[PDB]
Design a protein around this ligand. Structure first.
Ligand code: CA
Ligand code: CA
Lengths: 388, 199
């Protein structure tokens, strides 16, 4: 019966095969008695025939004509406890956008249909080694919680696979994996000051009315600690359980682990930016000279040092198809260095003609404007890409 | 601490049965643990050891583990002769130009030597690993580049002083640089040794 804003809901009672067995009677009520050896019922509630929420309370019972704790009458899905731990980050591909991880995965659930008797074996635990959950389920003809990695590419190296069952009915799964996962959400537009997210998704392969993720267990540190330094450092992590649509229909469970990572900033600052500053400052200081036959040759020579310095850091520049923050700065620096050569030629021509006071005034203007353009450009880059 | 780093190679063999069924008991030496092969090798082995321990099992209780550890180190004569000796001569060229009393030629030699330093970085590009963090070798090359580039800046200042008319002041800068410049390199090397090697 509805609580408020009654829409006169329609209810049905059919067999497991969809054949109708009873129909509602107008607080919709219905009764049915079955006499077959095996008798299974499915309760249908239809609301297809704009409304505000549901506000419903459904009451059912067996041999309870009164109605209006006891024992459960509806089937209940199994509850599965899941945990995941990450041990290493093997590598990251910045062109195909995928990364490789090494870790450990553990599952556990309770199912009385898997129980046995110790008398027929003289043992306490059963063993299924080097076999996946899907393979074992077919062997024993019992449903099992099959899973998969959502974004897996290629095969994965599985080690120490094993399932053990107890006479009560409690089973568990353990496996060590090395997998490569596709991550099309990478964004390298703020290189090398970019922060990424690594997502590891584990999806159940059965509908949510059979098996559902219930709890998260922490059997080990989620992110392990290893000796030495690493290219990518982890700042925070989280774990969550959600529901996603299934190809069959209804939904299935999903377990997600997200790691937030960032690069090594001391590497790029010292190796690239500090040497770049000294090369740029050399072209600024040559304007103090009052002769131009030597200023011109120093300015021309310093352009060659700038190009040669680009070869060393060629490995540190990714070969993507688009411009990043680092690429844009190097283009601006080259243009300003090349313009210095052009100004030097003009000054020498002025001095040879006979006008040297005009050439001296250009030196004063350049010595002030040149440091200003670099400061203005840096602020412009910060506003565009970082502070929205 | 590249290239003065020492590593350990561990080979672990684990039994797949609980310790109440099968347990490792003895170690037999049917052959030399580390064989000898003709020629030289990139990694040389200094010592080794073998041991038997017990580790927890996924079933429960414990299982046996057999471990072999090899202690290795690099070839030091390769890096000293190929990298450090040529680097010393390039650096010493920038130090010796301060004896010249003219600055129109000191400036052009100083500028030219900066290009040789950058070009020398291309040859040893293969010998520099492309990791995401700085090593001992990477830090030294950055300091050397900055000191070489500063020499060009000082030379420009001296030439301006001589053109104005003050040459005694420029001559005093030569004396100070010829003494301080070898001192900074010695101080930095000691600082690196204290930080990374002697705790
Ligand atoms: Ca490590
Ligand atoms: Ca050999």
């Amino acid at each position: 019966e509805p609580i408020g804003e009654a829409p006169l809901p329609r209810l049905r009672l059919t067999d497991s095969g969809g054949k109708p067995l009873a129909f509602g009677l107008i607080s919709v009520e219905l009764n049915y008695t079955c006499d077959q050896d095996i008798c299974e019922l499915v309760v249908h509630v239809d609301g297809t025939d704009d409304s505000g929420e549901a506000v419903y309370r459904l009451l059912v019972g067996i041999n309870a004509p009164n109605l209006r704790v006891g024992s459960s009458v509806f089937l209940e899905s199994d509850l599965v406890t899941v945990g995941l731990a990450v041990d290493q980050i093997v590598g990251v591909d910045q062109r195909s956008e995928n990364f490789s991880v090494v870790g450990t995965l553990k599952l556990s659930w309770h199912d009385p249909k898997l129980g046995f008797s110790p008398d027929q074996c003289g043992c306490t635990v059963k063993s299924f080694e080097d076999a996946s959950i899907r393979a074992v389920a077919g062997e024993i003809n019992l449903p099992l919680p099959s899973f998969s990695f959502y974004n897996q590419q290629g095969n994965r190296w599985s080690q120490n696979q094993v399932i053990f069952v107890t006479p009560d009915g409690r089973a568990s799964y353990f496996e060590r994996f090395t997998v490569t996962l596709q991550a099309p959400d990478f964004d390298f537009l703020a290189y090398p000051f970019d922060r990424q997210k690594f997502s590891i998704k584990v999806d159940l392969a059965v509908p949510t009315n059979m098996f559902i993720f219930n709890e998260i267990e922490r059997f080990q540190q989620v992110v392990g600690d290893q000796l030495g330094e690493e290219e990518w450092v982890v700042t925070s992590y989280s774990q969550e359980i959600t529901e996603v649509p299934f190809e069959r229909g209804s939904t299935n469970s999903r377990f997600t682990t997200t790691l937030l990572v960032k690069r090594n900033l001391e590497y790029y600052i010292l190796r690239i930016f500090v040497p770049l500053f000294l090369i740029i400052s050399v072209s600024w200081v040559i304007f103090f000279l009052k002769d131009y036959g030597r200023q011109l040759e120093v300015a021309s020579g310093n352009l060659l040092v700038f190009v040669a310095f680009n070869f060393t850091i060629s490995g540190d520049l990714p070969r993507l198809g688009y411009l990043t923050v680092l690429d844009r700065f190097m283009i601006v620096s080259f243009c300003l260095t090349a313009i210095v050569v052009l100004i030097s030629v003009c000054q020498k021509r002025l001095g040879a003609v006979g006008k040297q006071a005009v050439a001296a005034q250009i030196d004063t203007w350049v010595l002030v404007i040149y440091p200003l353009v670099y400061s203005l450009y840096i602020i412009w880059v910060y506003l565009r890409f970082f502070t929205d």
